[PDB]
Amino acid sequence: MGKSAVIFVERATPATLTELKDALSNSILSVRDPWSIDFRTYRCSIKNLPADVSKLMYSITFHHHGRQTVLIKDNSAMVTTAAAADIPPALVFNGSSTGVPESIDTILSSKLSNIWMQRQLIKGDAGETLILDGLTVRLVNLFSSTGFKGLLIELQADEAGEFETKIAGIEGHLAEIRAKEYKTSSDSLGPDTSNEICDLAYQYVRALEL
Amino acid sequence: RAEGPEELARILQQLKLDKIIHVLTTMFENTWSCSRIIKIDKPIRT
Amino acid sequence: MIVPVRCFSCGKVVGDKWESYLNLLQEDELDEGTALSRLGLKRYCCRRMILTHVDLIEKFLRYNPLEKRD
Amino acid sequence: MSEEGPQVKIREASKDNVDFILSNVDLAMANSLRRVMIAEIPTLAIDSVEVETNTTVLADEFIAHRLGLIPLQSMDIEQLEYSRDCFCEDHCDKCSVVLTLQAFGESESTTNVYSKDLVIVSNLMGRNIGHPIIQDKEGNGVLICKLRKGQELKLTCVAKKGIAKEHAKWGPAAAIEFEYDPWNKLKHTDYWYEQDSAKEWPQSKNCEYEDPPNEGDPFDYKAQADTFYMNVESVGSIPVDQVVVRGIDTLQKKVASILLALTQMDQDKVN
Amino acid sequence: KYICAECSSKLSLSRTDAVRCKDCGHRILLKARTKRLVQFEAR
Amino acid sequence: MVQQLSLFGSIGDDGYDLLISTLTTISGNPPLLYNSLCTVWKPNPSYDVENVNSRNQLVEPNRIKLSKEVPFSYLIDETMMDKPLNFRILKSFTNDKIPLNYAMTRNILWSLQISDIPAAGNNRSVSMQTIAETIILSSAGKNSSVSSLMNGLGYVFEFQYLTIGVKFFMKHGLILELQKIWQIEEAGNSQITSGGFLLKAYINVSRGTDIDRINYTETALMNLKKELQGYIELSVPDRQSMDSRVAHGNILI
Amino acid sequence: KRVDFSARTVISGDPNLELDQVGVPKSIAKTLTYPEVVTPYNIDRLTQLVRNGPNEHPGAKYVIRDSGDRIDLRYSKRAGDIQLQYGWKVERHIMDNDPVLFNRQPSLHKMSMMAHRVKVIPYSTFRLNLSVTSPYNADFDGDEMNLHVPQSEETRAELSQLCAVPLQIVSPQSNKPCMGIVQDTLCGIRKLTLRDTFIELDQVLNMLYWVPDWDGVIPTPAIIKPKPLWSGKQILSVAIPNGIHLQRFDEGTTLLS
Amino acid sequence: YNVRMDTMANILYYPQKPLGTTRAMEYLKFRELPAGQNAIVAIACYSGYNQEDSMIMNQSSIDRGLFRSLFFRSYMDQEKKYGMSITETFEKPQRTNTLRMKHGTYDKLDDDGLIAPGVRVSGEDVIIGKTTPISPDEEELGQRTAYHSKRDASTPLRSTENGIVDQVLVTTNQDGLKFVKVRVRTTKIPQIGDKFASRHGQKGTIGITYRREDMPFTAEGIVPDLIINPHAIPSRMTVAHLIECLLSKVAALSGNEGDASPFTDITVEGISKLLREHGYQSRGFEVMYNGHTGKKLMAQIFFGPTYYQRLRHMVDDKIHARARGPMQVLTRQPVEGRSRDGG
Amino acid sequence: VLTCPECKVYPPKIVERFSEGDVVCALCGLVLSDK
Amino acid sequence: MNAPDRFELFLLGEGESKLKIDPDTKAPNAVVITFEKEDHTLGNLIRAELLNDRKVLFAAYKVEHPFFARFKLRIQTTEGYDPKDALKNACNSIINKLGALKTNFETEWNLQTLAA
Asked: Where found, per UniProt (chain B)?
């Protein structure tokens, strides 16, 4: 079972990504294609709500994992696809689907706009992915509406035996570059049920919260 | 899809060069970690 | 109408100095130019703010929003 | 010492004013520095008011506009967030400050409502911010309104973070003097005279810091503007040295944003 | 609710009562501002 | 999102077998069995949606359809494993009773779908309807379930039904469906399409702006209808019957 | 008689606008319309315009069918629903480079009612080039002028091929130009071309960039050594087209003035 | 002005008594109720946005409260008594028993039918609820239903007027009928298209506004509150404008009221002498730098305070457009009137 | 009596646009009577 | 009222690129670069720095209308040298100069405080 972790640095500089790319250059084995990610928050527009019912809904869009959206609310996850190649053949065959769906963000922001309204949008484009010995590291700069926000690091490994050691090593590597205020997370949404992309989205939410 | 005789000659020269490079790189890897990331601005004087 | 808080031209603040400026005029019996310069008003735009102010708030105050005649 | 870079000579300083010379620098750089020092440095100011009781002789937006210009301490403004970015609804605890104003004219003699009576009721989280700026001897600060017998005013204020490119209320610098070439060696200005131009035009205080030109010297057609004389005064919210340093930092961040966008676009072109 | 015009006395009037003040007997009556402050957005 | 161009009709079960043969004579394809299960959800009345812009009518509340395929092992009783799994089994599906009951469907709790009333005007020869669709692949969390998800969005369950029928694929992407519909409640199961089959022939268009394609689709549908003249009458249904907004309640069945 | 599809507002001056272009405020552009016909060449942009709605510029306000029925887009929720066909009409807002007719009262002569191309701008005033204020006998201390919108293709062609500002320069009352450089541009073009005025490198570069018809060639200076300088006549000659010849001899001027 | 419910009223936030006053003003009381403000004016050419009587203004000055005016309006209504029965009532109408209701929002009305002070009214809202009883024999040609026992007679706001209701008054007239008066407040801020004038027949409109960074500045960091064109001086021969500028500058620098009465002994040379005592070029010129690049300007600039008045014509009251709308009863042509959205 | 010929709903819901001289059904947006 | 919001001066709209580079069709090795939400403060600085490179031939900027915050820059350099590289060098030099200026001012201010 693969494991993943996410570390977000808030006080980063524009050139910190290059600094961390060069500081790891000795162990860098290869480089792969760039990636992107989107992060929306939707708000509840109804006022007759109970106290225990949350008001937000976080939508995370993964571009490299085959164009998939994940909706998060109160530690509850939902995974939607929008590509014609991800459709289970039964739904196509029986007639439950017309074959060319839409992203759930269009549905939230077009038809249900009287229940949910957008509040923010944080984007990340042209990230870099590096293959190290039994590890893959992805770096990207986060841009909000106002401007630069911070640095995002996501780590993924296939063997879970020595994940903590790798996390500690990367933390130390950030330490020599004097990035001392960083928030990390490797939590799991469900102890018994393990879905990789849902756990990744939950870790993103836990890292990016203010 | 090559267009020029000079282009064809350059293509064949590069063919010989990178064929030799591939042969020796395979020789090293079958025994060695090369680097495919480093690019130097100025070629090293012979 | 109460004294403007800020100067319309150089961004400075003159609002708080009105009370102390009025003091120098009759307690110390000074002239207007020296009193204006005593409070750090050096650009003539700040002197313009303080010097030419019509204080109309002391007339509305003897009055009520209910029953003016004609 | 950094001998390859811009040089600076401070001659005078105080809580409000800094008076200095900037040498070995282009004219474009000094002009951009002053433009940024006036226009693009964040500060904390009142951005919304809601009123409960108004038995005064003034309007409501009148007092709102008067409140929107009062200066408040904004030393640690780097730890607040733009309210358009904070995930909170309306105003946050991390993306706003809140004050309250209450006054009542119990006495027969009229009572002045100053700015010392703004009381902060939100949680500051140990940040030095939100205090009103007071510069007069008596400590009363900006006078806000006037009251009589039987008149009351009650209202609540929300103060936020912004720049001066959207309203004049967030500006931390009053007026900055910018001079150079007091002898007109470069022939940048052409004087207007009746009889003798050398006498009608007074002399700047700065002439003592350069040597007068000699009539036997032909016009030097190779010089460039290199020495500037500046003076900067602050409204009071930010210390003036911090005004200069933050202007330099903001210019640096703008150029770095340009650099980052260019690198991103080059990576896109690589694809 | 309402308010007198001379002494500003606090009065409450129905839909049928005479429009007069009880203490001074004047014929000029003013309203009272909305006690519950209501927030608005200028659009 | 598609523009679906459709024509409707119905037949009595007596001719059913005959009809099937004729279809195979035209299409050149054999029928394929299928089934499905649809659940309809409506906005929660406990929540007051003042956001409906009453002075402008920017939007009106609507109903959401969630569909799923169910294996035939839930629909075949102990008397029917002997027969092979083909279309003839539909001949035994004439009773209002069905193996799938309320408790099993409650135990189950996909494709999410929203639609609008067809286009107005009397110069339309086929029912043109707009559909917005998405797919739910999986989920997780402490309350991972369709019911909990739709309550999180703000919707509640209204009813459900079960469709069983056969499909014919013809040229140009034309799909012809023969259906039987069973409404399901705790009180029991009732076949609304009693003693007959509901016939629906339709095509999908991916982009509504392309008009050459839409004209071609209408030409194909009208040619198909003119082929079946004298056997079955294919007609445009009532525009006011295919309206699924919450304010007004009716259900074409 | 009174008419429809018209507006009236004060004027102002804009030196950055071209000669035959008028700045139209945003709201006045949101109120007046134009009935564009849906065709294969515009159905995508027109569809996006209908989706935009009537509260956004650009947008649309009504949709007319083939049969004459007209659907108000505001009440009909179908901004995202109406599918357009060939021959329908979208009543869209007025968009950049739409011809308009523009005048000032009293309209004493032919040259007081001229055509213009629109440019949508903020704020509440109209914008004009500072050289058309002579035919209109208008200044900017409170004058209001009138705007009329054509509603067809023939009418638009008439406004674009007959009444355009470019075609109204040589007036037929006295067979001489009715427009020219006026006021402060005239006061400046004279201070520029004295023999006294010399220009350094950076300003010459900026000035040559400002001329939108430049060809990327830097004129060789007139004083190469000991310092490169340019004369005002040299930079101003860039605006003047090529092939223009002019001779004028004043009092007491020889071939070396 | 606080009490009076006039049909219209304009008030200025901060009025300033002029720096140059005639001696006669002490009898017109113009230093008690002024009508303008002392504005720093630089006569110059700058970017070409002030030609043909336009002017350029400093936007930071606008933001700090220069030339900002309150506006006050009022409406009246009363119950009419046709015959012996009261044919008009002040009560909030209900759609159950009323016909011909207006599209305005009746929600802001109280139970008395009168809105309360402190509510942001807007376009086409109603502030007075008036209902007319109708005799049963009167039917609107089939429009009336069984339960529509009354008609609406409310008074909506003018289509453009926005602001906050400021006062409501209830009284009775000579006949004892009820009487309501509503006063509404608003704030007006200068913008492109307004109208300003000096005391010498020199008026114009704002043509563009600039921020303090693009404004040319002097070596002392002073910035002109407005900039006018010099092509307005020669043909008008308003030398008194220049003399007023010079004398006001000297009075501001010195700090005492400067006489400018007619037929007196003050001369131009005398005030120029008094000017040079302070340290400025005698003819009022000054050295100013470009705002964009920061260079020096080749020509010096005439600079100094003046007095300006904000006239009564705003662009918000002159702007009008019409696509379609109401017609006329007889000729069936678009109606007359801007407030009635005519052609 | 004035009814929408497409909604066919009784009693009809109708809004008059005075500033445009139109009568508009409040459901389909159709324009019934002009001027 | 038609007054646009002020925050459109410093907040990019969605789908807006802060830079846009377009080759110039008239002169070889020339590019036109549009900057958004920026004014003379940046363009003057960048052009004055680009005028110091001996391999840079042409460098000029303009702000077409004072209503909108955006401006155009035009660069032309010698053969075998990329205008984007010239822009990068200019930005690096400006950043180094500003850093040196900040260090000098801090040293002088601290010395004055010691002498205060």
From this structure: Nucleus
Bridge partners of E29, per DSSP, are E4, H170
Whether D34 and chain H come into contact, CB under 8 Å, resolves to yes
Number of domains in chain D: 2
Nearest to C44, CA basis, from H71, H275, G206: H275
Do H278 and H254 form a contact (C-beta atoms < 8 A)? yes
Residues D128 and D113 both lie in one domain: yes
Provide long-range contacts, Cβ within 8 A and 24+ apart, for E9-16.
Answer: E15/H91, E15/H112
- Token code pair at residue F215: 């004209």
Q: Do A101 and F62 touch (CB under 8 A)?
A: no
Per the structure, the complete domain to which residue E42 belongs is given by: 1-43
CA B19 to the chain's CA centroid: 7
What ranges make up the beta strands (E) of chain E? 2-4, 10-11, 29-30
I11 marked as binding residue: no
Rounded CA separation D67/D156 (Å): 11
**Which CATH code fits H1-14+69-189?**
2.40.50.150
For H:1-20, CB contacts with C below 8 A are 2-4, 13-19
User: Angle A31-A32-A38 (CA atoms, 0-180°, nearest 5)?
Assistant: 125
By CB atoms closer than 10 A (0-12, 13-18, 19+), residue D120 is: middle
Q: Any residues with CB less than 8 A from the CB of H249 and at least 6 apart, and which?
A: C44, H275, H280, H284, H303, H304, H305
DSSP state of D94: S
Distance from the Cα of C65 to chain E's closest Cα (Å) equals: 9
**Is H53 a known active-site residue?**
yes
Q: Give the domain CATH number at D184.
A: 3.30.1360.10
CB contact under 8 A, G74 and F209: no
The first and second tokens of residue A207, run together, are 């890292």
Confirm or deny that E25 is annotated as ligand binding.
Answer: no
Cβ within 8 Å of H, G 108-127: 123-125
Residue type, D194: E
- List residues of I whose CB lies inside 8 A of any H CB: 1, 15-16, 18-22, 34-35
Packed helices J83-115 and J40-50: angle between N→C axes, nearest 10 degrees: 110
* Active-site annotation holder among H6, H53, H214, H341: H53
Residues 6+ apart with CB under 8 A from G186: G180
Q: Cα separation of H3 and C68, whole Å?
A: 5
For this PDB entry, the determination method is: cryo-EM
| Pair (D69, D155) in one structural domain | yes
Q: What are the distances in angstroms from CA C35 to CA C16, G147, H256? A: 15, 57, 12
* Residue D73 phi, psi dihedral angles, 5° rounding: -60, 130
User: Nearest-CA distance from D271 to chain A in Å?
Assistant: 9
Cβ separation of H327 and I21 shorter than 8 Å?
A: yes
Structural domains in chain C, sorted by start: 1-66 (1.10.10.60)
Exposure string over F82-111, b if 16+ CB within 10 A, otherwise e: eeeeebebbeeeeeeebebeeeebeeeebb
Check CB contact of E37 with chain D, cutoff 8 Å. yes
What top-level class would CATH report for the domain J1-115?
alpha beta
Chains B and I physically touch (3 or more Cβ atom pairs below 8 Å): no
CATH topology of domain H15-68+190-326: 2.40.270
| Shortest Cα–Cα distance, E31 to chain H (Å) | 6
Cite the annotated binding site of D by residue number.
86, 88, 92, 95
H78 has a chain C CB within 8 A of its CB:
no
Which residues 210-239 on chain F approach chain A with CB closer than 8 angstroms? none
Q: How many domains does chain E have?
A: 1
On whether the CB atoms of residues D248 and J105 are closer than 8 A, the answer is yes
> In the structure encoding, which two tokens stand for residue I11, read together?
């009693």
Give residue limits of the domains in chain J: 1-115
- Chain C positions in Cβ-Cβ contact with residue H227 (cut-off 8 Å): none
